[PDB]
Every structure is written in C-alpha cells, then in structure tokens.
Amino acid sequence: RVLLALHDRAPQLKISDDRLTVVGEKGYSMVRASHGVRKGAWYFEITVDEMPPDTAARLGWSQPLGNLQAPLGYDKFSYSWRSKKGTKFHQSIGKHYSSGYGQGDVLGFYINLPESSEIIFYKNGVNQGVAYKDIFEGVYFPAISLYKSCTVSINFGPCFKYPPKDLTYRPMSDMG
Amino acid sequence: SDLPMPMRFRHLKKTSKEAVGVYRSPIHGRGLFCKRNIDAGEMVIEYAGIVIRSILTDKREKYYDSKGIGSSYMFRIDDSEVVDATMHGNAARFINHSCEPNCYSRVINIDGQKHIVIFAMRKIYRGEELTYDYKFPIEDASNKLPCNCGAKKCRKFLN
C-alpha cells in the first residue's frame, strides 16, 4: 500500500511510524510517496495538522529527480502550492494562484496525464483552478515539502474527506 | 553451500559503485574499469536498463534513429526480453568487447524478474579494463566491424 517513501526523503524530516504524517525541520525539504503515476487521472489529500508561526508548506507532485533539499517547485521536476498566499511554484517561479491555506485545511491534489495534462489543487473540496497544463512527461509522485516545524498528514485514499464534485479520477491508493 | 542468489544480488548492488568506474579505454572510446581486485566467479555489475519485450526492440531502434540518437545500447536477455539501456542505464553500457575477455554474462532470476549480471571469469586486478565476449553473429564481408581489443588471439573483427 501507498505510503510516504522509506528512502526517498530528506533525512531531516520527522516521519511517523505509520508513514502518513510528517513534521518539518528548518529549511525546506521534501518527501515523495512510495508510488507514482504515468497516465490517467489520480487524486490524494493532505491535511494541515499544525502550522505554528513562521512555518510553511509547499505541496504537490514531483518526478523522481526533484531535489529533496529544496522546496517543492524548486526545479523543473515538480509543481507545488504554497500555504502562504496560495502561490503556485515551478522552476522556483512563484505565480498568483489562489488564497493561502493553513491549519485544519484539507488540500486536494489532482493530476491528469492523458495517454492536455493538468494539475489542479483543491481546498476543502473546492476546485481552486487549473494550476499547470501541458506539464513535462514522466512519473509523478505525491510530494510534500515543509519549512520548519509544521505537521501534515497525507491520505492516498480510497476514501477522501472532501471528494471533488464532477471530477473523475482514481485514488492514489489504487497503485498499492 | 553457496549464497542464495538474491543475497549475492544486493551485495553487488551495494558495492558495484565503488569497485568499478568508467574511463577512456585503449580498446575503444570509453570503457569500464576495475578499481578493486575482484575474485573469480564474483558478480561485477548488472547490465541495468528498461526491460522490454523482445517484440518492442524493432519499434525502439527506428525511434532512436528517427530522433538521431546514435547507436542503441540493447542487451538481449533471452528470446522474449531485452534490456534497453539507451536512455536509462548504468555504467555497464560501456563494457567493451575482448577476444580474450576477463568477464562473462549470465541471466539470473530474482523474484520472478530477469537480470543480466556480469561475472568475473578469473581474479581481476585494479586498473584492468572489464570486458566480455559480445559474440556477435558472423556477418558478411560488407559490414564487418574491426576489433581493437589488442589481444594476441584477437579474431580481427567483432562479427
């Protein structure tokens, strides 16, 4: 079954024994899930358990070469959504996307890779708009990057807290 | 008794990175070289890559040439599967041919998957180039690639 990866992670991140919860340590660092997707439409959820002052998260999708010692969205291998101001990040360019998210929010992550690629982010079930289209081809892993000591939990499915309306996908847990 | 094949396989995967390296070769271009003595019958390196069904090799050759990518780096496992290391692979891509080689290839099955592993045919000493016999099909006179392996029992051509 799908978990946060055992070796494919920054070492400084504090990951729970069940491997679904992760706490940040100092500068931005990243963990990928154990499974990735190449085609089709897929979904997973992240809950912000705790976001103390001066902490942040950049969440989204990463290819295997995305740098583990940088925020998600740092390089060409990943696309991210920042808790602060809801900025979307790719190749370290941050663009206007949505408003911010924080403690208690449940964030939804959709990707479609048709066999016209898209990445769409959700906040508590509400589509926040297409963030990126025609993305690089490759294998995309659910990915978490945290700036200091905040805490997030990832849900790969099959059951989601805020399953989006009028959106077809498979839960990431179908890869398990 | 001998070690179970999967245990020999992790040890290889764990230690091959520090025992071999790629350098310029007196035989041809770049080759794989020995950085620590290797005992006879030990695993040297896996020929790693994308494992494809044999039927897909034809489609992939024509694709590689259409993009003007140069030569393919495909090693056949058996009649049914091939390891394609053209775009995804490891340092085993660079092992040159020798008419008197110090390595050989062997297919091993680990957890229902097949792997090409290069084995030391004899004790190999650091600084030796690692080579095996390509065993190319005997080709006609029109396209016979000459051999530069530098041995005295050299066959003059790869095919």
Binding site: E115 | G49, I52, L56, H88, N90
Partner: peptide
C-alpha cells in the same frame, strides 16, 4: 541518459502497437 540503479520494467500502453 538518466542513470539507473535498478532495472525498470517497461509498462506498455494499450496502444503500444497501434499506428
């Protein structure tokens, strides 16, 4: 070529053989 440490099985598409 991207370096690889372990073999990867190609996952063919449904349309792998089509024009």
């Amino acid at each position: 070529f991207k370096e690889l440490d372990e073999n990867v099985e190609y996952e063919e598409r449904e349309s792998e053989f089509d024009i």
